[PDB]
Every structure is written in structure tokens, then in C-alpha cells.
Design a protein around this ligand. Structure first.
Ligand SMILES: [Zn+2]
Ligand SMILES: [Zn+2]
Ligand SMILES: [Zn+2]
Ligand SMILES: [Zn+2]
Ligand SMILES: [Zn+2]
Ligand SMILES: [Zn+2]
Ligand SMILES: [Zn+2]
Ligand SMILES: [Zn+2]
Ligand SMILES: [Zn+2]
Ligand SMILES: [Zn+2]
Ligand SMILES: [Zn+2]
Ligand SMILES: [Zn+2]
Lengths: 336, 336, 336, 336, 336, 336
């Protein structure tokens, strides 16, 4: 850029909202969001401690309130999460594959009464359904403990096929187990579900930003370490290897969890794989950080959230996984 | 990445701590920090609410109280923002360019007494020193108002040369006025300050994350927004234009502000000007956001500020300005 | 690609209306449109037969009425075109820089009444304001006629500086005359208008698609050929020099006329100048093709108008000029 | 660049048709073209005034009529389409794989009467030959309706092998069914037609421009909406992955349908696959659009048809499928 | 680099140890070192002639009374080279696969007492273990003397399996035999050690900087050279292939050997494989070179060894194999 | 890089000396060497202990016989370095720019009894001729000592005009003062030496590899670091700014000193400025290191010093400055 002052004034293009908006590089809208719904196996509906305004819906008319409202705001794609009582959690997380489950009743339900007016994403992991709360089967092999890869993946394979049968449009493995997309695809495709798609949590990072979702889903270990499956957050370039394998194995969409502390990684993923669609999870504690600081007084809650989503899109995410979606979607007239 | 499962299992590199540390793309230390000091004539220490624990020191023994504390931790670079009473602000900003004003008094104090034991960056702006809260001279053309450019640039020059005359090692224009780097670098070269550097706040954005600052600086704009000179969070590639021109003008170091919600932009700049040092400002807000969540339950203050500051490095920043600085430095045992 | 069938099924993402929208690369709105107004000295709104729908509005209530229309549909960006009768046309151009002629009044009216809720681009040429209709001063040098650059350049500087006074946010030169942008920028900078912005028709081509413009503005070359000055349509890369020079000269926005038939150029410019706002002109004729073919049986109007505007976006343009502007902006019902 | 007015004047190279023709980046000719022949079983020369210009040829004595003319102008490539009545179409589409069908008899003939003096492409789709009108076999997977991917490929195999036998030099799938190239290949290879090559419509877009070729072959659809196979026109980068698969899978030439509206794609595909050849079908509508504006006076049919064909060439296209071909061919005086 | 003098004065970033360290591109700490231990069956510490200051340790109680001292300074990663009395040395090399060898003892020992507080790599080659001292197994075709690639490769497999059996975290094939990685990778997986990892001497040059190590290990060749396996020094680009092939093969870490004299290759590989963690070997007599010259008078031992270690980093290396590391690490204040 | 073992066996190309030689990316001849001569005033061939092998030749038979012998080995180009004692040194460094000095006599002589048969680079720097050993002029302004950039740089232009007049083909500035090549080519051009070229020591690192030369020449600085003018070895990319400025300023040849421990900077520099011819200085320490390692036979002095030199080629350097020039030019028969 051998443009030069004062012949060229960058500020001409910031003289007025009507112009900044014309020449703006990024744009958001409600379609870019996926809303996550927490689903518990009948009962009351429960407020969620870390996550203001977010709830754990039992699988009923709690739809009426929420999936239909969200639709009437523009949000029309959803990702579902099992949240159990400890009383049905076993060290090989049977929860995940139980057609009379939690989530597969939620899927069945929503997809019955809404049909193709919605798209349902379905989380594929054991950490919401295991005794110990890691994302897989453990092996007390005679040295030390570790979440064993090759048996834990076949559990994800079953997990998927339940939801595929129950009618979910997408399946989306968050395990960070290697070969996960491989052994799912080959499940699905063997059970005649070529129609079903896979959105891989491919570059999922070992983050403190999960604090709230651990509380809000039950998932939370008893030997407290993700670090031997979730990516080391010092590593950006590592993420390319992970997106590339998760693509040869045949995922359809790819993502980066969390987003806000990883925007640099989104743009490095997006610009080596332009042809891929790219999602990104405005995660658990990126929410409650805003909210903490919004009410405790510090930051205009409206602006700072749209600033934080415009950021995620600007980096290069095509789809964003916010718990905000709804309260962001009536945001229809932004400051930027 | 013509690479398969199960021949290469990415988790081999995740599996120890000794190894993840062995292979980690990024690392960080207290050399990388720049701690900001708030500074005032007042005579009485004065706490910033929406911080906190960051105070508005008067020019006295924040010396061999506080700068000397910061130093003992490996933190030897400081940026000064002067603050003051509405009593002594006018529309043309004088308190800035004023040999006897706050910042100069402080610069001279800190230099004469540490000396070359530390660096002293000096913010150059008029937001802390004006009547209207804005960063330049204001005018009216007809329908509307504006911050006239080339009349304020000249004021930045005076400030720059006032703080240089006092001892300043670098001058750092925060205004986003066009041309300023060059009107500073020249006015400086003229007064015999070839030896004084310029750290340009090159790509600084119209952010909602500044809230806490304006209270810390008595600098909130008393009418309207800054969206008329600070960049449009919508825009990444715009910052390659802004950084290029600042380099051509004589900027020794170039920065991205705010840092956390613009990591994509850090990396974009850095992957383009590999040969320039790149600063990043972990702002007023991404401290206040954190201390908020921290206080009110949601997150581990320690592990999430070191995820956040590490994220800033990984994207590309060589230096970080942060109000954590001191606390982050005793985090001298790497939890990742 | 390390990507094979059946493992990867590219149709998965084409499966529903809902996911196709999800992963789509491109999009549109009235925010992206620059609607032209054809403005005339006095009388009636004359219909313009080769371009059904768009009349020639007489500068006054009936116009400024029709601009509220545009504004209620989201459109807030107008490029002003002066048309006037034979009797006021002459060899060296007059009307164009007659301070209370056609377009100055139009600029003013629209600014005074709406002002900072609406952006005004003002075209800078001598086609609509000359005897011959050629876009510059015509000279004779012992061979044949030729359109003189450096004396027509000068006349633009006069035209731009007039519209500048009248209140125009932007000036936009369509003459393809060399160094035009710099003369306009130096004039404007000299007569006080550093605030005022230039949008070069940098890469305007010698197309057949302008015919119905020369019926709307009576710009018809009374003899000969634009080809002496407008770009040779065999040349894609030639337009990288045309952009690059206009950018050094001091342009702010850059465009490519026509648009539909030069989509590959739009990509080529945009991928060499990611940091520059690009625009593009869905012209005089590309509308007149969609109309004549639709009007007479051959293709659906609202799908082909939309599909064509979705192109220009996809090809690269942040802004599209179109005489489809409004009808496409009520196409909020995105049919793909 | 480093290239400046007035020292460099672009217009020196615009100032005569003798240097514009010298420095021109692009050329065209009959050699570049590929002429479609709509063929039908028994009847008169049925006119396609839904276009118009083009006719529907009765397989037999009116090759002289056409092919032998075209060839006299240097048009020596032909892609064959088939038209049948409703009495002769069924849900599996047997028009295709019937050696005394329409399209296989037209091959025998022209290959018999001309030999290697004229190359012959054959269209491999069911849309001309099914009673629904869809490009594939329709199904009803327990719930909604769809076009079965794997099953409809295996018909395209039979079609291709039938047309190989019957005499085609090349074959061309346009169903956009994933794997079409792979299976048409193995079929052809293992009936010893490794000689015979595949011109994949590998980036066919779901376009409003086909309206005419619907009324030219009776291939419009009953439960109608092609968006589940034919591409999402928001998508350019999609097309790299869609081409790059058809190359692995053994395609020979790669193409983009439509052309005019997707020139931006062409440049993208060609700059990523410089080594593969690349055609682009100038559509039924892009031809018709021009004609109906020619009807009602808005453009010079001759200029705007050479301007369009010279643009597809400009973009990257090696070959061009055009209904103009025969007009375009006898324009031997390049009017630009 | 459009930057010009005197307005840009590159010396401003060299004026102060503060600011010179601020903008420093590169950094070092013990966490980058892998220290090599020479292990012998018994007796005492033989000092090593050429490498003044390293000993051959007996697999005794100077494990800890070196390895414990290594730990303290901050060096926790070791690579284990065996050193045999050449009674136990044959043409097939049978210290390599002997479970009660030296290397297997010292693995079994160090991990017994240090556990996963220390990482342990084993060297895998047969120059320490054959009577002829070649890295593989010799043969004679119609040729003469030649190291057999495909037989010898199987012994590295047998060697590695043992070292994992004995308990090594990692394994490292230095023979430069082709395809050596998936032959070692398929043993390890096929004997359940999915968890063990491979640091691959990918680009290991045929160098004279090994003079000292040949003496420390008894690994000198009795005949011929290493040139028919180890890389030819003239070639940088050959090392991309050699790396790229070892990463398809299942490798984890990838080194260039030796280092100082092949830094241009270290940058060349790191810039083609940014996602892959790259090691490098500050090799036998890159250390004896320094150690000689320091006694000799000529050069400063401290700064020259840190300049050389900083170098191998500044290039790329994420890990350095060095015989300095211990004395290196207690340099805790920067030369540069 | 989709070669796969065992189909592709890298070792085929290492088979024999001939095939290695056949494919080798790099070569040497003595054409690439530039031999330095330390030249002293008072007649007495004085040996150099921290070399050794090199002398302080006095200007006469002894010297001119040395170069006579050089040329015979093909060493046909030299760089002259003036050594002289503590009487002829002084703060401003006069010694350097006296035309009856050593270095201007040494030139004129070689030029007399050789002329066009030989090329003579002249080093331009005050560190050989000052009281204090610094490469420029010290100023003790305030209470910090600092080498003054704009005052030393005029005295470089003197020294330069002087050697140009003695008959030097090239002039080469090694002081790393900024704007030096500019100052030197304005002076040469003014006194009418437009054909006298400049080889800048563009990117000269502050090394510990220089201690032997400090002894040879007496450049040993009496007080302090060279750190404030020499490049920090931590930085590679900083080199490109340094070269690109030296090119714009008028350089012809560009160098990177030292070489061995900066091969990586050579590749980085040479890949960005491929059209610039690049030299590299094999230094004082990279000679004396080797010599000592050889003298206490740790490593083979013939193969190491061609291995070292072949590396400086492989990296990018078209010319190498060595003291091995001759002993390495005779070594006709390759390593390697
Ligand atoms: Zn989980
Ligand atoms: Zn994975
Ligand atoms: Zn400010
Ligand atoms: Zn700026
Ligand atoms: Zn015009
Ligand atoms: Zn132009
Ligand atoms: Zn079809
Ligand atoms: Zn396909
Ligand atoms: Zn070996
Ligand atoms: Zn290998
Ligand atoms: Zn010197
Ligand atoms: Zn320099």
C-alpha cells in the first residue's frame, strides 16, 4: 500500500455511518448463528448458575417457548446437549447410545412438530454421560490413566447412528479423539445415512472458557485434565493438521472452539481452506464474561457482544455457535 | 498434510506435560509486557472503580513505591497517561502540551532516578486533556460536527516534543488522526530528537472494550462517538493500509488495539510486516471483563488471563500493553 | 484436495434450503446498493423507454419524495446524473460546472432534507453536458478528432469542486481520462474539500452494454468512439494498473463498469487489492437485457435479477450500482 | 505499482484499433467454439422460437443443412442434446441407454458421414428423458422426496457406454451427481473405451438462465426445484472442490455452467488448475437475453455477442459452448 | 520495505538493552534443550577426548548424579546413545535388540527413578553396535560393499520395540535408511505401543561435524563413508521430500542434523511445514569446535555458545539437541 | 510431494559419487571467493596469532607477491583492511581518510602492477583508525555515550572518495550507520565516480565471532558493546529492512555478515531479493574456530572448511568473503 498522506486520508471512509456501512468488510445476521439447547430427561426446567438467562429445558412444550420463539427471530438451527443426573452414568457412557434417551427424544420431538423448518445439530460426546466425566472410556493400564482412543471412537460411532435414526440432520463430534470423523462416517454410511452430515469440533482448545458449560451440562472430570486430547492453546498452526485430517475423513463443516481467544486461528484455518465452510463456537464463558462485566457495571452489554460476534465472522467464521443468538438477533441496528 | 489415521495420531504430542511444553508453538514472559501508569497532579492517590487495583498515581512516590515494584518483577517499560480535573481542560487541549503539566512532570521524575533502567513510552493525545472529551479540535461543517484532522496533528506534534524534551524514550500517538506519525516524527527530528522513537497505535478500533479507561482517564467523549476516526470493527484488511502508512511515516513500532477481540487482525498484520515489531493492547476492557467473571464465580482469573495473554503472543504480538502486567509476571509457572 | 467419493458427498450441503443458506459464501442487501437518480432541470417525470420503471425526476418534491421510498426499502446511497436539453449543450462542456445547474441543486436538496441519513455520489464527466457527447474536450490534430486529456482533466477538477460546494459526499469520475483522479483530488484538497471523497470509475470498458444510458442522458457519441479512452474489453490485467494508479492518485473507492460481463476482473482487482473497497456497475444495459427478455417471455424476472446481483457480490464488490436497486431490496425473500 | 501519471499514460495504447489489436490480452475464433445440436426423432425442422434463431434437427438429411455449414466456417466440435415427446419418457429415463434411441443414432450418422473431420461430444443426463424432468432417479426415503445419488450415477454409466459404442469421441455428465465422473470412467474403461474422454460439467450452477433450454428439450421439472444437485450460486470456492474431485475421478476437460454470470468462477478455477483445460457453456438464456434486447433496439447484437464470447475467453475459458457459434464464426473483423 | 532514510532510522531499536530485548525476534530457555547421555555397560566415567567436558556415564549411580543436576537447571529431556565395548559387536548388530543391553537398562533405570518427570528418547541405529560401524547391515551385489536398506530397516524396528518395551517415551531413527519410519511405526503399533512417538532424523547430512561423536560412541566406520545413506550437503530442497516422506510415514517430531552449518535448511523446512515441531542437533563437534577455540584464546566461550543456540532457534528449531545444555542453561542473563 | 516409499527411495540419488554430483543443487569455484588482506604502514610481515595463517602484509613486494599467487589459484578479487598503531589514531579517525594512508597506497599499488586483471573492494569504516575502537564518532551528550550517526556518515563518504581516487572498483561500508550507502553514493557520484560501486555490509550482526579480527586490525573497542549500531542476532527479518534500504539508497551488492551462524538469514534475504546479488562474510571466528579444532585434531580441516563454505552457497550467497580463499581454492576435488 504505496498510497500516501495527505493525498490519501483513510478517514474519508469513516466520516459517516452511511459510509462505514457501505465499505464495511464483515457482516453478521441471524442466519449465521446456531443456538445451543440444553436438554434434561423430563422434569422441571432449571435456571443455570454461571449462564444468566440460559436454561436446561425438559423435553416438552418448552419447545413452544423456545424453538418457536427462536424461529420467530431468525435463528433456525440448533445444537442439543444431554445433561444427566449422576444415577445413569457409567464408565463407558451408555447414556450416549440409548434410543429412549434424552436427546434422541428431543430430536424426534423437535423434528416431528417442526420438520424441515429447522436443522438439528447433535453433540456427539461421552463426557456428558460418563461416571468420571472425561470425553471417553478410560484405561487404568498398569502405568497411569488416559482416555483411550480406539475404543472410545466406536462409542461415538454408535452415538451418531442413534440420532441419525432419530432423525437429526447433523452429528458433530467434540471428543477430540483422533479418527472420530472417520469411524463416524463409516458408521452412518454403513447404516444408510449418507444423507446425515458431520460438523467436526476439529480445533477444540483446552480452555478455561468452558467453566460455565461444565456446570451447565454435568460434564466435568474427577481427575481434572483435558490436556491430552484438547489442543494446546499455544498452537495455531497445529490446527491446520487437525482440520485437514477431519476433512479427508469426510467432515462437511469444521470448527474452532472457543472463538474469541482464537480469532487468529480462525483466519489461519479459513485462508488455507477457503472452499470449506467454517463454524466457530462463541463458547460457554465468552458469554458469562460479557454478562459478569455487563451487570457488575463495566461494558455496554449490547455493543460488546455484537462487537465480539462481528469479530468472529471477520476472522472468517461462516457459522457461529452462540448461547447469545436470541438476545443478539433482535439486535437489528448496530453501532459499528 | 497427506496424513492418515491411524499412522499419525496427533495426541502423541499432547500426552505428557513435558512434551506439550517441548513442542509448544508459542511462549510468553515479562519482557513482552508494557505496564501503563495513570498519573495526575492531585497529590492524593485515587482508585479507578471499573478496574480495580489500578490507581491514578500522583507524581510523588509512585516512584519508589510502584515503578520500583513493577521493575523488581522483570517489568521495565511503561506508558504514561495523564489525567486531570475539568477545571483545567479547554477545547484546544493545552494540559497535554505544557512543560509543567502532568505527564512531563512524571516523565522527568521517573527518568532521573531510574534513568536507563526503564523505558518511558508517553501516550500522545488530547482526549485526556479536552473539554469535549474528544481526541482533537472539534468544528462544524453545516449539518454536522467533526474532529478536524490537520489542526490536531499539529497539537500531537507539540505534545510529542514536550514529552521528548522531558525525557520520553518513545512517543505513542493514540489518536487515529491521519498523518500524525509523520507530523510527529518531523517535528521531533526538527527539535533534535532523532533518538526518540514513535510507537504508533496504528490499527486501533472503535471498541466497546474501552469503558473502564474513560473513567480511569476522565476522557469519555462528552458528546457523540469516536466512530469517525477509530477503525470499524468490521474491517481487518483496512489495518494493512493503516500499518503501511504509519511505517512509511517513521513509526518504529506499530500496534493493534484492542487486542483480544482482534487476534485475527494481529496475525494479518504480522503475516505481512514480519520485519516490524508489533505491539498489542490488552485493554481497559479485557481486564475488567476478566476481573468481573473472576469476582463473580464463573472463571479462574489466573488460568484465563494466561490463556488470554498467550493468545495475544500466538497471533503475533511482540509486545503486550496490559494492566495485568505485574500480576501476569508472578504467573512465572506456566499452567498449560 | 485429499477428498474423495463416496467418503465426501458434496451434495450433503445442498440438501435443504436451510443448510444451503447456512454455508453460502456471499449475500446481498440494500446496504450494498447505489441507486442512480436521473435528474433534469425542470418539468415532468419523463418515462425512459429502453429502461422501464426509472423515469427522469425533475429536481423537486416529486424526486425527494421517491428518495424516501428508496430509503424506506433500506437503500440510502445515490449517484446523481444530470440530463439536460440540446439548447444548453456546447463543445467545452459548461452545464457540468454551473454552480446552481442541475445536479448541484439536486445534491443540495437531498442533503439539506435527509443529510447523514443518506449518501450522495455525484458523477463527473462531460458526456451528459456536451454538444458532441464525448466525455472530454475534442481537439483536432492533422489526422482526425481526438479527446484531449489534460484540458478535460482540468474541467473535471471544476465539476468536482462545484459538486463539493453543493454538499456532495462523494465525486466519481467516469471519463477514463488519465490522471483525472489526482487532478480532482488536488483541486478538492485546494478549495477546502479534504472531507470530500472520490470513487474512480477506475476500470470502465468500451462496452455495448451502455446503449440505454445514451438514451437516458442523451450522451450518445454524435460521431465516433469511446474506444480512444475507455478500456479495451480484451484486457483483464490492464485494469490492475488502472486501479493502482487511481489509488496512488488518491481514490478511496474503486469500481469496474460494466459489472456482469467483467466479473472475472472484479475478482482479479479484489484479490490484488483486498484492502480497497471495490464497487461495480450493473449497467444501463444489463438491466435492459433482463427487462426485454423477461417482458417478452424468456426468463423469470426476480430470480435472474437476484442471481445477477448475487454474482457481483460473489465476484468481489462491496458495492453494486444498479437500476434494479429498489425492486431487488423488496426481494427480502431470498430465492436460492 | 511504481507507475505514475503523466510519465506513464495508459491511453497511448488505446489510441488506434491497430495497437489495441496489438497489445490485446485475448483472442477468439471458430476453433474455440463448441456448437449444440438439439436432435429429435421424427418430424419437420421444429423451430425453437422460445429462443429464437436455433432449430431442432431431425436426425438425418439436415446435417447438410447444419453440420456441413458450421464446418465450412471452422466450427468442428458438437455437443448433442436429445428431445423426446411425453409418450416416450419414464421415471428411469430409457431414452438415454437405447442404441436406436435419438441421440445414439445421431452419433452413428455424423461419425459415419464425416469421421475424424468433426469431434462429437454427447450429453449424459436423464433430464431430457425422464417424465418428472429431473436430472436423476427420484426416490421417497420414508419421509420427504429426493434424487438418489448412487443409483442415478449408474444410469449415466449406461448412457456414456451406449454413446461410446454409438461413436462419441467425448462424453459429458451434467446431473451434478457426486461420483458421476468416477463411474462413467470405470464403465468406459472396462468396455475398452479408454480412448473415449469425459468433459465434466463439474461446476454447474442452479440458474435462472436455463429457462430457454427447458423450452428447447422439455426438461423442466414436475416436483420442481434443482437446488439439491445444481450448485448454490452464492458459491465460488465450492467450485474448486467440485472440479478437483472430477479431476481425481478421471475427467479430461472441466467446465462451468452458466458462463456470463460466473466469469469470476472461471478465473478462479483456471488460476487454481492452469494445467487442465476448461470450457464454459454460454447459456440458453445468455444467448436469448441478447436476442430479445436486439429485438427491441437496446444493443448491437453483433457487438454484445462478440463482447460476451470474448469475455469468457478473457476469464480463462479454453473452449466455449455457445448457440451463437455460427454467427460468431462469420465475424472475421474483431470489432473492439 | 517501502521505508526510507532519514525518516526511518533503524538504529532506534538498537539504542537500549531494554528496547533491543523488547523487539527481539527470538528466544531461548532450557525448555528447548534435549541433552544427550552416553551410556556404557560399566566401570567408571570415561572422559571423552574430543568433547572436553562430557563423560561416558556407567549405567549406574550417575544416572542421577548427572540427570538430577540436569533436572535442576531445567533440562528434562534426554536422548540415549549406547557405547559398547566391541567384543559384543557383530555384522548384524546385537546390542540393538538385546533387552539386557545398555540402552534398555538406562531407560528402565531413569524412568524407575524419575518417572514421567523426565522424557526419554532413544537413538535407534547400528553404528554403535556393528563391528564395521555402519548404520545398517552390509552386503555385496554385483556391486561391492553396500548397506542393505530393507533388511537393516527391520532391525531398527526390532531395536525400537525393545526400547519402548524397556520404557522410552520416544524413539529416534538416525540411520537414514529409507522408509524407516513406517517400518518402526508399524512395529510399535503392532506391539500395542500406539502411545510411543517418533523423532525422525529426516534431514541428517553427511557431515564432518561428527568427528567427536564417532569417538565418543565407538561408532567410527572401519571402511567406506556414510555418503550412500546420510544426505549430500549440497542439497537444501532434498530435505523437504525427506521430511515430507517421514511425516506421511507416521513421524511426530522432525529434525535437521547437524544444525549451525545447515541453518538455511532449518528455515527452509520450518517454512514448508509450519505445523510440524522441528528439532535440530547442535552436534558433536559444533561443540568441540567451540570448546577448542575457547581454550585457544580466540573466542568468548559464553557468548559464542549462546549466539549459536539463539541461531538454531532464530532459524526455526523448537528443540535443540545439545551437549552444552547444562552449562548453556545456567546462562540466565542474555549475551545479545 | 506425493512420493511414497517404497516406490520412491531417496537413496538412489546417493548410490555413487557421480549421481550425487549429478543432482547437486550447489557448486563452488574459487570465482566466488573474495580474499581479504590486512595491510599495514611500517614494513614488516607481522603474523596474527588468533588467525593464524594470515599476516599484516606491508605494502610492497611481499604483499604484491601474495596477490600474484592468489590470482594463479583463481582468487581474483580482494577486500583491503587498514591496520595501524596507536599514534595514527584519533577521535575523528583521520587515519581513514588520509589519501597517503596505508589502504589508499595499497590500492594504487595493486592497481599499478595488475590494473583490470584484479578487482579491489575497500572497506570503509572508522573502527580501524580511531582512539577508541568504535566504528563511528562518539559523543558524550548529557550523561550517556553514543556513536553519532549523521556525523560519522559524512566521514565514511570521505574515506570512500579517497579509495575511489586511489582506484578502488568497489567501496564497502561495514559500520552499520544508517543512510550510509546513501551518503557514500552521493559523494562518489558528486566527485564523478558514477562507475564506482557499493557493496553494503547491509545486515551486519553484532557478533562474538569477530574477536580474531579485533586482534588483526586493532578494532577492539576500548569501551563497550558494538550493540547500538550492529544488528541484534536474535533478528532475521530485521535484515530485509536493512537490505532494502541499502538497495534504494544505491547499493549494488548486498552482504550478510557473519555468514555461518546466519545461513538462515542468507536464505531469507536471497528469497526476497533474488534479483540482487548477495555476498556473505565467512568471518575471523569461523576461520579461527576451525583452525583450533583442527590444530587439536577434533575434526578434518579439509572437509569441514569446504562443508562450511558449501553451506554459505547452498543458502544463497553468490560471493563469499573468506580467509580460507586460497587453501580452499586449491582443494579442487570435492567433498561431498
Ligand atoms: Zn465432551
Ligand atoms: Zn481429530
Ligand atoms: Zn485518545
Ligand atoms: Zn493511522
Ligand atoms: Zn462520460
Ligand atoms: Zn485512469
Ligand atoms: Zn440434466
Ligand atoms: Zn460432481
Ligand atoms: Zn547411526
Ligand atoms: Zn527417510
Ligand atoms: Zn568497523
Ligand atoms: Zn544500513
Amino acid at each position: 500500500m504505496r498510497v500516501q498522506f495527505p493525498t490519501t486520508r483513510p478517514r474519508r471512509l469513516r466520516a459517516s455511518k452511511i459510509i462505514r456501512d457501505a465499505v464495511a468488510e464483515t457482516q453478521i445476521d441471524a442466519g449465521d448463528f446456531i443456538y445451543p439447547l440444553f436438554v434434561k430427561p423430563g422434569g422441571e426446567r432449571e435456571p443455570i448458575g454461571p449462564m444468566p438467562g440460559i436454561y436446561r429445558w425438559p423435553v416438552g412444550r418448552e419447545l413452544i417457548n423456545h424453538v418457536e420463539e427462536a424461529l420467530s427471530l431468525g435463528i433456525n438451527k440448533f445444537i442439543l446437549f444431554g445433561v444427566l443426573p449422576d444415577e445413569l452414568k457409567n464408565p463407558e457412557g451408555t447414556g450416549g447410545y440409548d434410543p429412549e434417551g434424552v436427546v434422541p427424544r428431543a430430536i424426534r420431538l423437535i423434528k416431528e412438530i417442526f420438520g424441515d423448518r429447522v436443522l438439528v445439530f447433535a453433540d456427539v460426546c461421552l463426557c456428558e454421560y460418563t461416571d468420571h466425566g472425561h470425553c471417553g472410556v478410560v484405561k487404568e493400564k498398569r502405568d497411569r490413566w488416559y482416555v483411550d482412543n480406539d475404543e472410545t471412537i466406536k462409542l461415538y460411532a454408535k452415538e451418531a447412528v442413534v440420532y441419525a435414526e432419530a432423525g437429526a440432520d447433523f452429528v458433530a463430534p467434540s471428543g477430540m479423539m483422533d479418527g472420530q470423523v472417520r469411524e463416524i462416517r463409516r458408521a452412518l454410511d454403513a447404516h444408510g445415512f449418507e444423507e446425515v452430515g458431520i460438523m467436526a469440533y476439529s480445533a477444540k482448545y483446552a480452555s478455561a472458557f468452558y467453566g460455565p458449560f461444565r456446570v451447565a451440562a454435568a460434564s466435568a472430570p474427577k481427575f481434572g485434565d483435558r490436556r491430552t486430547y484438547q489442543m494446546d492453546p499455544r498452537n495455531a498452526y497445529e490446527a491446520l493438521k487437525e482440520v485437514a485430517m477431519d476433512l479427508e475423513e469426510g467432515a462437511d463443516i469444521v470448527m474452532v472452539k472457543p472463538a474469541l481467544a482464537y480469532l487468529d486461528v480462525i483466519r489461519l484455518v479459513k485462508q488455507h481452506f477457503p472452499w470449506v465452510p467454517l463454524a466457530a463456537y462463541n463458547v460457554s464463558g465468552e458469554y458469562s464474561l460479557v454478562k459478569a462485566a455487563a451487570t457488575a457495571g463495566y461494558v455496554d452489554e449490547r455493543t460488546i457482544t455484537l462487537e465480539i460476534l462481528t469479530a468472529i465472522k471477520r476472522a472468517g467464521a461462516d457459522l457461529i455457535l452462540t448461547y447469545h443468538a436470541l438476545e443478539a438477533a433482535k439486535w437489528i441496528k448496530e453501532g459499528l
